[PDB]
């Protein structure tokens, strides 16, 4: 499992979380040196248990798919809760057994879906460490509506950092004080699997991509991704996507 305590946090102990969660995703393989995510793995090894406390200690256990770094559901206290999908049902055969109730959550997991249910789209909704707190303490208690929104924080805050170096960056920015995402983030979150797909892509292209992924910059302006000497893939991406699940 990974651990992340709100309490005391700070950009370094956060920094750890992010790193303890990236080594806890197994691949046999770097592809231009950043590791491979696997096509599948059978059974409950699929799920890693991510223990996320509040800054007054209370937790939720998160289960995530090491095949894509998807979150599928959680644990608060006695009830497990699990997206609207059969990835999550399939999940629920595996983990949070021992809860004394199972709620599906009346969405699926992804993006445009979460930003319906929750009233925002991801661009006006801060993240940061305090956002992540007020997520935790959001999803301890049912309450559909609230929850996609501290969803749409938890996903960006563990999984979208774990991918990408930038937004585990921007994350510790906001340690102490919360910030709607940069245009870059949203741009690297909404690219990975394309990036993922390219960058194996190039591995028999001489390190050309095969179509060219148009990004945003950390300085806000609109970028041409060709080829794996790019910094995106030479600094920042971290986890590739399977092309088998692609
Ligand atoms: C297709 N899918 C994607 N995700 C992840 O859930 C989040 C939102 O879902 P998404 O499908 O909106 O992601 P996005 O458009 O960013 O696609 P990507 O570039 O391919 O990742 C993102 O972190 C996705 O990586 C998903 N998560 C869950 N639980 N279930 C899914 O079916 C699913
Ligand atoms: C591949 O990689 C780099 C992208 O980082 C490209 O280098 C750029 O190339 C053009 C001129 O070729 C310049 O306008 C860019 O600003 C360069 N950037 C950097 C950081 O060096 C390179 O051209 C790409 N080429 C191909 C053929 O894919």
């Not at 651990?3 to 303890?20: E, V």
Request: positive net charge; aromatic residues 8%.
């Amino acid at each position: 499992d990974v651990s992340f305590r709100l309490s005391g946090a700070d950009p370094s102990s956060y920094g750890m979380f992010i790193k303890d969660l990236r080594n806890a995703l197994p691949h046999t393989e770097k592809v231009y040196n950043i590791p491979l995510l696997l096509p599948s793995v059978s059974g409950a090894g699929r799920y890693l248990l991510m223990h996320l406390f509040n800054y007054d200690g209370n937790t939720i256990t998160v289960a995530v798919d090491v095949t894509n770094v998807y979150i599928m559901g959680y644990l608060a206290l006695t009830t497990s809760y699990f997206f609207n999908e059969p990835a999550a049902d399939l999940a629920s055969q595996y983990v949070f057994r021992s809860a004394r109730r199972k709620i599906t959550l009346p969405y699926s997991g992804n993006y445009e879906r979460l930003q319906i249910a929750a009233g925002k789209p991801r661009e006006k909704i801060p993240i940061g460490l305090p956002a992540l707190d007020t997520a935790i303490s959001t999803l301890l208690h049912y309450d559909s509506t609230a929850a996609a929104g501290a969803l749409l924080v938890l996903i960006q805050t563990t999984a979208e950092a774990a991918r990408f170096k930038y937004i585990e960056q921007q994350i510790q920015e906001r340690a102490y004080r919360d910030e709607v995402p940069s245009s870059a983030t949203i741009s690297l979150e909404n690219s990975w699997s394309g990036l993922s797909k390219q960058i194996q892509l190039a591995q028999g292209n001489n390190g050309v991509f095969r179509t060219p992924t148009v990004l945003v910059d950390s300085k806000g302006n609109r970028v041409q991704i060709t080829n794996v000497t790019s910094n995106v893939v030479t600094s920042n991406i971290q986890l590739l996507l399977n092309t088998k699940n692609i």
